[PDB]
Structure 1
Amino acid sequence: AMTIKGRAFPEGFLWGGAVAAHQLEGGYKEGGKGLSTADIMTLGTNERPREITDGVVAGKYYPNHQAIDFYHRYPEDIELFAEMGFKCFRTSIAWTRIFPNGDESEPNEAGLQFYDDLFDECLKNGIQPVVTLAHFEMPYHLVKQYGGWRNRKLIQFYLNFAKVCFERYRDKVTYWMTFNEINNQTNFESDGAMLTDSGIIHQPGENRERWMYQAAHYELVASAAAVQLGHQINPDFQIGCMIAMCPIYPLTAAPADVLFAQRAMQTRFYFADVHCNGTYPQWLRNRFESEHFNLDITAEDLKILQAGTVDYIGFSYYMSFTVKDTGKLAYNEEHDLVKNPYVKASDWGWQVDPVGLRYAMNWFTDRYHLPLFIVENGLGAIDKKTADNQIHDDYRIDYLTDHLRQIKLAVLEDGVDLIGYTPWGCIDLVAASTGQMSKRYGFIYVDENDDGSGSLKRYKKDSFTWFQHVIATNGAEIE
């Protein structure tokens, strides 16, 4: 029964922080940038959904247009990351800075130069960029013109973008991921998931589930083609998938509940099966037939999938879910979840379950036997900044400490292969679900309110010093 206190994480462990371009950069039309799917989502709340508009509508507030102005302020924000001691910085390359409309024959030089400048600023401070190519910010032109990822043509458009980035940043970036949280669209009834993952805005009469699987198929093919392409450009690239890991528990030991939870996880994680094993699960191929989807899946696609399996599994962890049998062995995330009575929840309703992260790490390890990278984890919570500009975020420290304890057990005791750990929203940024600044994740407070007002000044929260010390001690004190 030996303590984990005093034992560090492995040597070479990548501590850092994670963001996405559209949530912090602002500068949404600077440098020739095109309009993205993030730029058409208005401000919402936990109770009122963001509105998805047909382009920019006069008079409406779009939080992603200016965000926190990291497009201009990155030198000073990176200084703060370096003060905390980050080894890496996980962000996205904005697709619309490189291919503003998506279907150009040549990339945008000003966009490429922006990321050279950003990555150089990181590297000058000893911080390695870790890059996600698709992160909920595809060109709105591809949505309007082609129907988004309904259209097979997007595979090549994505690959044109991937190729440019892999070549330009060949000597600057080692770790890449293809499609952020590709499996959010498991909830095929979620307008937000469908737009962010796939550029799908529902058309009357369409079969939502059918089109989700078609789009996901093309994305999986594009990912596999990109893994092969990237390795041709630089064989030392590590190219991963990115899975939203919300584990799903059975409510009870009733056999039907246990089978329903197994199918729920098969449904939410088939994307990982394809990314890692290179083949579709047969239950799901059988579903396509029994639901009469008639998907466009070719022999060439299947060959690409098998040849383009990933090097590691990047994943996010925030929460777990629970299900009971509904009477039909098919999981519909919009309707089939029940609240877990054993755990508490955040103010946005997200269940707090650190033990579930140890479960999840074992689940991925035993299924796939690949290295993992925790590329998002965090607690969205209200902060109050005091008169003397302090932020006493003990609630956020507690959440992160509790999750790190379970991660540390999974690494030291269970022997999970973990590349690194990057908390989400390390500088306060625009929330995805709601567009709120008030749902704060950061170690660094940004003085911007939900209505966009404020000085935009940055202040260190108490969690900044906490995480700085975790990094300095390589997690040794966590117990």
Structure 2
Amino acid sequence: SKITFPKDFIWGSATAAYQIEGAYNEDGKGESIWDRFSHTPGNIADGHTGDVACDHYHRYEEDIKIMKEIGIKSYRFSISWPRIFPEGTGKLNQKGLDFYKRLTNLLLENGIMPAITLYHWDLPQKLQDKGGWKNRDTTDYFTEYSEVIFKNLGDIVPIWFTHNEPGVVSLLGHFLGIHAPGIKDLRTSLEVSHNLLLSHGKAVKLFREMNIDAQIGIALNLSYHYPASEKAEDIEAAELSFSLAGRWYLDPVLKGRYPENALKLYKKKGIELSFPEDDLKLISQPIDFIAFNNYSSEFIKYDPSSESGFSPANSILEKFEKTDMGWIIYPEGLYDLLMLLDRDYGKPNIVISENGAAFKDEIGSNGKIEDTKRIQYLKDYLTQAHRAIQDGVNLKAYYLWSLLDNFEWAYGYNKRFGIVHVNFDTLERKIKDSGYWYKEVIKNNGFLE
């Protein structure tokens, strides 16, 4: 049985700015919280940095020539705020604009469709010195930068993402402090979460004011949260996890509310926050699709000693193959999620900003990367992607994470999500077999499962 996606279905591959671009202090780019976080011992694996990375900034021509060789119909990327405004507000750095302008015009001229992400974590370090996302003034400055991009690139770019995974930014970056800007306070973490969503709201409101002939959305970190057992205590423990995690951002967008069962968990520890009612009507602002990033699924159990009230069910996850990240493989966990978004939020247009996997890659004696596991992963998860479309889901796009091997944040360059192998000493690209697989999948518009 050979499977075929809708004839209009946009195939793509995704990257971030800091994870590929390099040139961290070139052409008047301001310092970001990631430049800062990376240059401090104990933050990044092996002391790695995003100083050079894939050096896309100089080698983008080579990349596009690879992107077209595989024949992706859409290339999802991020704009570095600190290349546009070094100081986050005020003096425009025209050199930065003209990089991304030029890049987008090469894409449109190589018959590839641009898909920008406006914030992919690289907040200008100057704003971090005035409180960063905790300072509500940042949400205004994010709109200013948004404005300038829309004036230049508005009409000609069809697919916009305001934010990438605000879930992680606030959780890792502002509570656990293992991501930039390295802060560790729960209260701040929630005040940033709001201030992120608000900034999304302002950017969509501006997007409409300026009347850009293109589609906007938000890229959220999302998994399915299964209960450990079909018991009243576990099913509830899992509902709470999803609410803290993904639903905390899904409901304020889409439903104009925060999840209750999560809010009750915060106030049971002596944290309440008066959301201004008018902000939630600005966050809920209609959007042309919902985008998300999926890799794995969570299996939550009851735990009345974990101050959360729950924990991972280590008895159940030790039955799966686990990827190089230590995340389970479970392809049907994508289907169920796509059906959960379809059900609970009124059959919206869905995009997948990011799916993909990290396995240990080698270049063999044949000078090739035969990453059969990545390919196996890919087609397993894309079969469930198709299954969902057949059972009614409005899944318009799939973007593969990632196009190149890149900087994986606090893991450094010790993790490869690329379909194009990158040697971080020579910056030489060797298109993986998962890359040659994908080329055919785009051509045939599917594969024989």
Give the TM bin, normalised by the shorter chain.
Answer: over 0.9
Query: 1:442 is matched with which residue?
Result: 418
The count of corresponding residues between Structure 1 and Structure 2 is 443
How far did 1:328 drift? 7.2
Q: 2:256 aligns with which of 252, 258, 278?
A: 278
Aligned pairs for 1:105-124 within 5 A? 105-124=90-109
Query: 2:439 is matched with which residue?
Result: 468
Query: 2:147 is matched with which residue?
Result: 163
Deviation by residue 1:437-457 (Cα, 9 ceiling, x = unmatched): x41122211122xxxxx2211
Structure 1 stretch 383-392 or stretch 14-23: which is displaced more?
383-392
Query: 2:199 is matched with which residue?
Result: 222
Q: 2:134 aligns with which of 122, 132, 150?
A: 150
How far did 1:314 drift? 0.9
Aligned pairs for 1:7-156 within 5 A? 7-42=3-38, 50-51=43-44, 61-102=47-88, 104-143=89-128, 145-156=129-140
How far did 1:288 drift? 5.3
Say whether 1:398 aligns with 2:376: yes
Query: 1 CA distance for matches of 2:159 and 2:211?
Result: 11
Aligned pairs for 1:366-405 within 5 A? 366-368=343-345, 369-405=347-383
Query: 1 CA distance for matches of 2:357 and 2:61?
Result: 26
Query: 2 CA distance for matches of 1:189 and 1:105?
Result: 30
Deviation by residue 1:372-407 (Cα, 9 ceiling, x = unmatched): 111111111211112342111111111101111110
Query: 2:311 is matched with which residue?
Result: 336
Amino acid at match of 1:267: L
How far did 1:106 drift? 3.9
Query: 2 CA distance for matches of 1:234 and 1:10?
Result: 29
In structure 2, relative to structure 1, the CA distance for the partners of 1:49 and 1:422 (3 Å cut) is farther
How far did 1:217 drift? 0.7
Equivalent residue of 1:192, what SS? Answer: coil
Aligned pairs for 1:345-384 within 5 A? 345-368=322-345, 369-384=347-362
Amino acid at match of 2:415: K
Q: Is the 8 A contact 1:248 1:264 kept in 2?
A: yes
Query: 1:410 is matched with which residue?
Result: 388
Q: 1:231 aligns with which of 208, 232, 238?
A: 208
Equivalent residue of 2:5, what SS? Answer: coil
Query: 2 CA distance for matches of 1:418 and 1:49?
Result: 40
Query: 2 CA distance for matches of 1:261 and 1:276?
Result: 21
How far did 1:119 drift? 0.7
Query: 1 CA distance for matches of 2:270 and 2:292?
Result: 32
Say whether 1:420 aligns with 2:420: no
Query: 2 CA distance for matches of 1:235 and 1:137?
Result: 25
In structure 2, relative to structure 1, the CA distance for the partners of 1:146 and 1:259 (3 Å cut) is same
Q: 1:172 aligns with which of 151, 156, 159?
A: 156
Deviation by residue 1:316-370 (Cα, 9 ceiling, x = unmatched): 11111111111279747xx822332332201221111111001111111111121
TM-score w.r.t. length of structure 2? 0.93
Which sections of structure 2, spanning at least 5 residues, go unmatched?
none
In structure 2, relative to structure 1, the CA distance for the partners of 1:276 and 1:223 (3 Å cut) is same
In structure 2, relative to structure 1, the CA distance for the partners of 1:322 and 1:117 (3 Å cut) is same
How far did 1:49 drift? 6.0
How far did 1:294 drift? 4.6
Query: 2 CA distance for matches of 1:43 and 1:366?
Result: 45
Query: 2 CA distance for matches of 1:360 and 1:98?
Result: 36
Amino acid at match of 2:142: Y
Deviation by residue 1:245-302 (Cα, 9 ceiling, x = unmatched): 1221111112101111111112212211111112223444555554443535223323
Aligned pairs for 1:280-295 within 5 A? 280-287=258-265, 289-295=267-273
Q: Is the 8 A contact 1:405 1:478 kept in 2?
A: no
Percent identity between the two aligned chains = 33
How far did 1:75 drift? 0.4
How far did 1:142 drift? 1.4
Query: 1:432 is matched with which residue?
Result: 409
Structure 1 stretch 11-20 or stretch 180-189: which is displaced more?
180-189
Equivalent residue of 2:183, what SS? Answer: coil
Query: 1:201 is matched with which residue?
Result: 183
Which sections of structure 1, spanning at least 5 residues, go unmatched?
53-59, 203-207, 449-453
How far did 1:61 drift? 4.9
Deviation by residue 1:126-178 (Cα, 9 ceiling, x = unmatched): 111111111111111211x2222111111111111111111110122111111
How far did 1:210 drift? 1.8
Structure 1 stretch 340-349 or stretch 462-471: which is displaced more?
340-349
Structure 1 stretch 132-141 or stretch 323-332: which is displaced more?
323-332
Aligned-residue RMSD, C-alpha: 2.3
